[PDB]
Amino acid sequence: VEEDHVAHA
Amino acid sequence: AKCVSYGVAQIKAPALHSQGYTGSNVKVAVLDSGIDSSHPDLNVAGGASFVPSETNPFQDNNSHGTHVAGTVLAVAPSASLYAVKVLGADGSGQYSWIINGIEWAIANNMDVINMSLGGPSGSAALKAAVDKAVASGVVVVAAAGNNGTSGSSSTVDYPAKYPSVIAVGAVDSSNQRAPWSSVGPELDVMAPGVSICSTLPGGKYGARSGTCGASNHVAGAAALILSKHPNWTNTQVRSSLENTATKLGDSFYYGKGLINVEAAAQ
């Protein structure tokens, strides 16, 4: 969870 | 009103269309916010959603994936597009969702993965997923990012930053780098990405700017190449694109330069 990042368009 | 990316002509895709190569039977995964398959000008051969709260890959609440779809199809009109929904209506998606979409694409024998998206944090999980895709024979294309310059240091986003991905930066109609186009060693090639006119949900059209838009053209170009040469590996498709690019400026800012799909296809 700490390691699950977020990417964006 | 209806419109088409000026980028189609600029990468020389019409020279392939007139030869009879329009991307027929080449499977392109659009890892994005979905694709509005209602749009009278889009064709979607399938898809799947990995956004927990948005399980319909065929409803695009953001509009971004629909715009990607239209640019890809404008380059490769006969390509099979698949809506792999990994971003929400807000334009954000967790790495874990993106990884499931990549895994899905491999398992459904997609020829090309487009990822018009990026994040600033690295991930060994995300790197292993794109590498696995590349080892599987998939051509993986990604937007370099919209982070502009930071002196001599790299501003390329993940996943584009990984060696196995084709990192695509943005030019305008003059072959001039967009000011916001990310830069660095990892930048591979450029494509049109300033005010790229494409499809939007509800049968609409609109111009949008970003490396996001540049990546769309290269993914379409890969499909055209695989159209003409269905026997070429992803290694080979990437080589042609990189080796036949039209040299622009310095490689930190322009990579190998503008893609030339006509030259890539021979």
From Swiss-Prot, chain B:
Temperature dependence: Optimum temperature is 48 degrees Celsius.
Domain of life: Bacteria
Annotated control of activity: Completely inhibited by phenylmethylsulfony fluoride (PMSF) and partially inhibited by benzamidine hydrochloride, leupeptin, and pepstatin A.
First-tier enzyme category under EC: hydrolase
Keywords: Calcium, Hydrolase, Metal-binding, Protease, Secreted, Serine protease, Signal, Sporulation, Zymogen
Localization terms from the record: Secreted
Complex and partners: Monomer.
Protein name: Subtilisin BPN'
Source organism of this protein record: Bacillus amyloliquefaciens (Bacillus velezensis)
Lineage: Bacteria, Bacillati, Bacillota, Bacilli, Bacillales
Region of the whole protein represented: 108 to 382 of 382
